[PDB]
RNA sequence: AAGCUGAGGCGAAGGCGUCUACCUAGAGGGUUUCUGUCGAUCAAGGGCGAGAGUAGGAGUAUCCAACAGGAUUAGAGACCCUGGUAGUUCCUACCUUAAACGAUGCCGACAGGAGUUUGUCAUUUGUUAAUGGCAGAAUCUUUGGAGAAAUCAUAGUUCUUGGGCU
RNA sequence: UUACGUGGAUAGGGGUACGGUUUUCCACCGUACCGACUAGCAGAGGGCAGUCUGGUGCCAGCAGCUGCGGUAAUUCCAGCUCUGCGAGUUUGCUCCCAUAUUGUUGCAGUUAAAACGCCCGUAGUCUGAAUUGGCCAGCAAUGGUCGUACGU
């Protein structure tokens, strides 16, 4: 059964960059593709496209090589802005890059832009 | 209530560390090793508490109150210069510059006592005053405005009596 | 994987958590209480009146006989060997005496070459033997 | 009269046609010879028997003992060395394991919070692994001193760390291991890609084509 | 990597691969640098070269052939070759 | 139930080989049939479960725990030899264990080539074949990663630590 | 060979007054006069400073652990030197860290201890995609345009 999707599909992006190739094929979903959007903010991807099958979907990525990891951690574990500088020690490698993609209020946004918008939420994962 | 002033090292017997201990016990004339650890657990207060500073936002009001009064606290006892006064500079410091200043020292440097262990003879024996207020306390720690004002208690220094 | 993860799953991870501290030792021995039956009952030391003088000798490979007084306690009227360390001291030690009886330092078990026994004497007749074995106190 | 080189890369060296390691690095030459290390860096790179131990091959008589040694290079600025040695005297073992570490040689460095002056720390997490052993080196805030195991630490030192954290797992007593894996862990601080090392620059002339006719003629 | 008051930082910077886009180490002594003569049209060497690079994992798999394939006719070094046809 | 009989097939595992008729189950393939999330894994609880063993009938050829001789040996309660009842076969109740072993729990995704092979379909007259598709079953390798090592396309994607349950 | 008869200084421990102090003593804080007795405890194979000299000879004994002692003891019993910490310093038992050897973060289960013999299966935990956005000014908060879908 697929018990996650977010935490499938970032998997299989991660196998793609180790080996470094140069697209990958992913069911797809409206998280994985706002999760894909934006890693693509910060330019660690290329460019893809969200094709149609009326049905639950496919993704095409356009890697660029410059992307270590794809985490997906679960369950969803909330999380509070005065709480939250404990997940970036804990998850993330070093301090001076890598992002943490939460689902704040707003929408799903990294650590960087949720601090700014001052609203936490639930977390969906990193990359680095 | 009370506290832990000094805290005891992790292991008793390595060299390297030993080694480095005397030669900060030498130069600064000092009685035990306990008395470096002390100075070493004063250091990691400031420290701990800087960290953690550091850790918050760059705009969060727990960080603009505490940094400015830590760094008022630091400029007073004459360790951070004002080139050096920016939050980060505190993480470094070294027992080696809050050694300096205490008063044992400070005499020192004035040169009245004429030697590390004169300067502990002298505020020992009740000779030497901060602002007409004799200090028999050989680690006063010294306050840079205050520094000025170390000198001769009276007694046998300016008294002359044997 | 290999444990439960779900968000609403902490019974089973409270639960399963409770069973597997009975596979420790040190949860086990404090727990089962299961210490009561001891002859020291607990106590790091304990006291009480000499029996006699016996001989106990080490293992193997170490060839020596160790010299270990019985020593019945006061508090439960048991009887248990005692070790009596440093030369002389079982000379010092004298017959139907008073001593404190403490333990082997090794937190239970059986220490060094010597089995059975594990109990030394620090006092006697309100003393110390490193006192005695020294020599700046003295008995009567 | 000195050692002679042997081989291309003595070669340029004498000459003096390449100045500085950074330019065999990049360019990632294979250092065949010791006596272009103590001529590049030929100052303040120290020797440090790491340590000694015995070890013992079974024979129809009985037992011919061998001496298994370390030694580690290091110079303060952001380099390390390491190998290790067998013989039958003690001497051969610790001036062969000297030469070992010269031939096998550059540690990247940055910043903990913000980026202040001058780098004293690993860029970011990373573990070496070497058999049983695991290292793990952590970045760490500025004035901390470093904490490791004081055979690890003898050979961070070197490295030139200023402050650093660490994490170690496994069978650690097994200390050919245990330096190896920290030697290893250094290794992987220029494998990990990082933001900052995006872009292109233009790719460096390869010393050996830019000076192919002092070579020969 | 940036001092951030100015200036650059660290010693050396590692090359990048052209196929896979990884960082060349100091150690992997598998890596390699190639020089590709370019030509005037009539073939006629200019005097100017294009260096091609590949990391020691690319060479390892097999697969650095076909890099030079796709890498030389995007340079504009071919004709043909990349891209079909099989039957 | 020999030979055919194999790193071949089927079965949830234990296990299943002559041929004929009989009742019965299902995996895989194909499907521009239908429903629409009905599912995954599981304390209790329920069934199936080699061989030995037990109870009661029906058999009793072969082989055979025990037992009886004969050899050998210092002794031989054994190995070797000659005989031998219980069991070995069928039916009705039980028992519920094995190195019950891939010593590898179940469902889900992705990551590398190579040629074998079983079932079945597709486009071709290379039609008991060629190439390709799903589903099995193994294998090889100068491939990557893992591991203490032996080794393993899973024992990989794990201090670059979090798909779900036991 | 800079620590192993001199040269002088400066204390407080202590003593005796008086002034403070407190309900009263003590002790403290002052002021003046008297002045040439103050360090142990634990060790010196390795973990973690002697291959000194003397006595002992698997005996006495040490030793958390590994080990030492059988007449050459770098571990015993003594002396001398040296080391640690220092008005402190060993020794028992309980207890946390060391320990990712209790694992939420965070272990392990082919062979080291560890996958129910198999299938069904309830409690339990877990449960594919889909629902108001696009476009421009961005540094965000937001503000315009495209869509008018016209209930209370």
Known sequence: VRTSVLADALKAITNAERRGMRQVLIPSSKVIIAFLKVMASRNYIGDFEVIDDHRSGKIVINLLGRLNKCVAICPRFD??????????AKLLPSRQFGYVVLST???????????????????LGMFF | NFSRTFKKPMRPYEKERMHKELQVVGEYGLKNKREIWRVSYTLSKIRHAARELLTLPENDSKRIFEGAALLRRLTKLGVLDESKQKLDYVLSLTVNDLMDRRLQTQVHKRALANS???????????????????????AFLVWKESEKNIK????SVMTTEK | KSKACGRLAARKLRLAHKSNLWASNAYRRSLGTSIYKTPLEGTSMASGIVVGKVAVEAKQPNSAIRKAVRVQLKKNSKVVTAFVPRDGSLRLIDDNDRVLIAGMGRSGRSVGDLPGCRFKVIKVAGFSLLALWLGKKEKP | GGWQPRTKLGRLVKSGKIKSIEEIFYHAIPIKEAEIVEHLLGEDLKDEIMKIMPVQKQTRAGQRTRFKAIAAVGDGKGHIGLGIKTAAEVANAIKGATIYAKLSIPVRRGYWGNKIGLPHTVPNTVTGKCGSIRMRLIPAPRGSGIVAGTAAKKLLTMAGFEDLFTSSLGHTKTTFNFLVATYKAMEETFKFLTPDQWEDRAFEEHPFVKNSDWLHG | MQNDAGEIVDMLIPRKCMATDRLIPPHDHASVQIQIAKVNDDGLPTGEFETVVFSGYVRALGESDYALNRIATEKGLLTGVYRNEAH
């Open chain 1, 79 to 88: 999380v509070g802005l005065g709480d939250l500088e404990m997940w970036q």
């Open chain 1, 105 to 123: 209020d707003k929408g799903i946004m990294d650590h960087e832009e949720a601090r700014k918008h001052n609203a936490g939420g639930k977390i």
């Open chain 2, 116 to 138: 590390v262990h004169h300067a502990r003879t002298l505020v020992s024996h009740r000779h030497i005053s901060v602002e007409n207020q004799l200090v028999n306390q050989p």
């Open chain 2, 152 to 155: 001769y208690a009276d007694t």
